[PDB]
Amino acid sequence: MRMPKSKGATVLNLEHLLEYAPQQIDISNTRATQSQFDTWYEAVQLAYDIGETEMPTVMNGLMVWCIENGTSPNINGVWVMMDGDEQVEYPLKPIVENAKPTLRQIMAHFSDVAEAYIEMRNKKEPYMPRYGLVRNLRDGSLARYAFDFYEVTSRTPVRAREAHIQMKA
Amino acid sequence: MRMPKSKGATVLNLEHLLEYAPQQIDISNTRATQSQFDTWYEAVQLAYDIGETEMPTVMNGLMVWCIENGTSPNINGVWVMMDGDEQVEYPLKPIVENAKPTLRQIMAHFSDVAEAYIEMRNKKEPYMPRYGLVRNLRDGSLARYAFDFYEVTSRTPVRAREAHIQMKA
Amino acid sequence: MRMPKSKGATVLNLEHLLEYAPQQIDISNTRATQSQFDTWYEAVQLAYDIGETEMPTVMNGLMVWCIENGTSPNINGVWVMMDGDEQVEYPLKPIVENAKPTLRQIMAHFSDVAEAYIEMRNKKEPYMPRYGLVRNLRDGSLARYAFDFYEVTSRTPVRAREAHIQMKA
Amino acid sequence: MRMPKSKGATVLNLEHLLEYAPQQIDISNTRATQSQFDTWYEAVQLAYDIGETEMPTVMNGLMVWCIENGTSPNINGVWVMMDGDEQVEYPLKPIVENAKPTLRQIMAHFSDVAEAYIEMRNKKEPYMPRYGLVRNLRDGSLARYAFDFYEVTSRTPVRAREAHIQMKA
Amino acid sequence: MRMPKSKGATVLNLEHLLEYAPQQIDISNTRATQSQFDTWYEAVQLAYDIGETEMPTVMNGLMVWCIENGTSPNINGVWVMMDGDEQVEYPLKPIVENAKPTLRQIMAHFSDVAEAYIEMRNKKEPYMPRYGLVRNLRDGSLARYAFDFYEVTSRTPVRAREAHIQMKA
């Protein structure tokens, strides 16, 4: 093999070269960077006039809303939260404006947790996310992966990779 | 797994995260929100000069009309109600103007009840909604699902999902 | 045979003609020339204000970043390095501007080493570069070749040649 | 690179230039200078016979008026303030006079605050400034940029830059 | 080939022509000559009553002003310097006078240094000169070329050549 050279010197080290072991999600372009996610968090927090005691509760339903309604909604719209049987409405402009590059990449930070919620739902009655009810997904084991902000990593079953290709087609 | 992080703190809670259990129809974009449905109700009520004693009766036939004539009609038109053998006419502009985002989403609040009416009809003589007589649906058990404002949830038989895909194609 | 002639004289020699034995990568247009790589190295070094003691470490992650995120990114963007659990951000404009003719050819100097890193990763948990998770590559032995700046030489297995044709299609 | 030279000596420090980091709005010709704004403030104060206890209230209504009626009005005209349900009438020549170079540049000092007021109005009922209701702007998210005295800096989203080009055309 | 001839004798050495290798900027008409620049320097120095200890600081702000406000301003105007938070006001006729042929050609001597300042600003927050924010330049990499007194030589990337043609159109 040949290691990169510049003016007769190696430019890629020898020890740390075979020691750097990052995580796939961290250095991937499918999700927004940590700085971008932080900016989106406070911008949404400042727009809704919510403190640090109710904001975690509010963001629980936004992830659930994006499971069943996607991550590319109309800006001039609203997304719903339910406190009991009442539909509590929130403006959707702050969610999208302050999300860079796209809301899907920002929502991709919720990929791991969103499967836990769907698996919970798939313990009482069959629950299939709408994103999979419009692309004709019949499997009941792939319901945990039927949201548009899912991150495909090197831990995803092969059937799921084919399903997302079929879904997005 | 990794839960969303912002400035070294979890932003998705731990207990209410695995307790929020909404209903699919409530947080879905296939139907208008409760506020939107309320606005459409009074706007139509105020346009027809009807009180709270005949309006429930009038809206019974509007749902039946939309079963057999769809939810995307010409605004400058009329929809018919039958009191005995006489065709009582109502303007159709108030139904569509005041419906946001679309009349189909507003009519989607009648998805559950519209199946009860069709099943009633399918107890004396075979009744197939027109929306299914123009897309060549031959099954007699799918007649209860042959209206354009049907809501596909995680309780719909798999054959029905294929039928609507075939119908809308 | 006929050897090139000009004014009644051979113009291709006889001894050194059958002695010149270059290497395929050196005289190939799939990678930038040594002068071009040197210019890109110092230009990136001068833009980041880094000496000759940390620059080899920084370029380790840029190669890893290009494995999972390609070699044609948006100039007005950033690429991430991880020191522990923190995302250290670098501007991406110096990487692309000063790379001639393209960053893929400049990154092609890292083709040999990038396989060593992937093979390392493929010793603890299955690691498939993202560039192969979006083109539906299922083989686990071709993971070492699933980056866009791979150089196809006369040492590459035949299956790999077909895979890259299928991947790039 | 080459420095500017005069009689064999450098004419630029290039050490304080590294220090020199002015703000874009301060050294821009899109807004009047601080001295010009001070002249306009006192002259308007002297024309309306108002002290330093009601003038801050007075200029609150002037900024809102320029949002909905532009910054190029007739000199022989009036601008309206509302105290309750009554229209308080103010002469408009004191505004369009003593405002150099133009009233738009003087009004550009209110660009930041004018967006806070618009974002306030877009929390109860949809509010689009009349400047955007005559140029066919159908995106309510861009309502915060629909005043002619908006200042385009290097913090404006790319959407707003295209919208203003479309509006001013 | 044919040499220029006069009375049966060559009029060109063609041995010193091989020696003659001038710089493109030096013998270009896009910038004022050295004598013209020296005249503009002393005349501006004599007009502002400033010595040789503060003038290098003074011209630092003038170059930045021309980046964001162009090199064709009104003679009966002022250009702003910032010492801290205060706007220092300077007359602008001493600048647009004693600057022949044009101020742009005089300002062209700062083309190399003006890019260093812009590249400095594009290290903390995105900074695009106002010259490019009014001509719809959406590429932040080309921010280093977004001043009207830029000199196009045979070292400018092909991107910048097309951008300036698009901008000046």
Numbering used by the authors:
A (entry chain Ag), B (entry chain Ai), C (entry chain Ae), D (entry chain Ah), E (entry chain Af): 54 to 222
The paper states:
Potyviral CP plays a role in virtually every step of the viral infection cycle, from transmission of the virion by aphids, virus assembly and disassembly, regulation of genome amplification, protein translation, to cell-to-cell and long-distance movement. CP consists of a highly conserved globular core flanked by two large extended regions with a high frequency of structural disorder. The C-terminal high intrinsic disorder region (C-IDR) is partially conserved and packaged in the lumen of the virion, supported by the helical ssRNA scaffold. Here, we show that we can control the shape, size, RNA encapsidation ability, symmetry, stability and surface functionalization of nanoparticles through structure-based design of CP from potato virus Y (PVY).
We have previously shown that truncation of the N-IDR at G40 results in an insoluble protein, whereas CPΔN49 and CPΔN49C40 with both IDRs truncated, self-assemble into single octameric rings and their short stacks. To facilitate sample preparation for further structural analysis, we attached the His6-tag to the C-terminus of CPΔN49C40 (trCP). Cryo-EM revealed that the affinity-purified sample consisted predominantly of trCP double octameric rings assembled in a head-to-tail (H2T) orientation. In wild type VLPr filaments, the N-IDR is responsible for the axial connection of the octameric rings, with no obvious interactions between the core regions of the CPs. The truncation of N-IDR reduces the axial separation of the rings by 3.9 Å and shifts the twist angle in H2T double rings compared with VLPr filaments. The blob of density in the center of the two rings, which was already observed in the 2D class averages, was assigned to a cluster of His6-tags, because it was absent in the 2D class averages after the removal of the His6-tag, which also led to the dissociation of double rings into single rings. The octameric ring exhibits pronounced charge anisotropy, with positive (P-side) and negative (N-side) charge predominating on the opposite surfaces, which explains the ionic strength-dependent size distribution of the self-assembled particles.
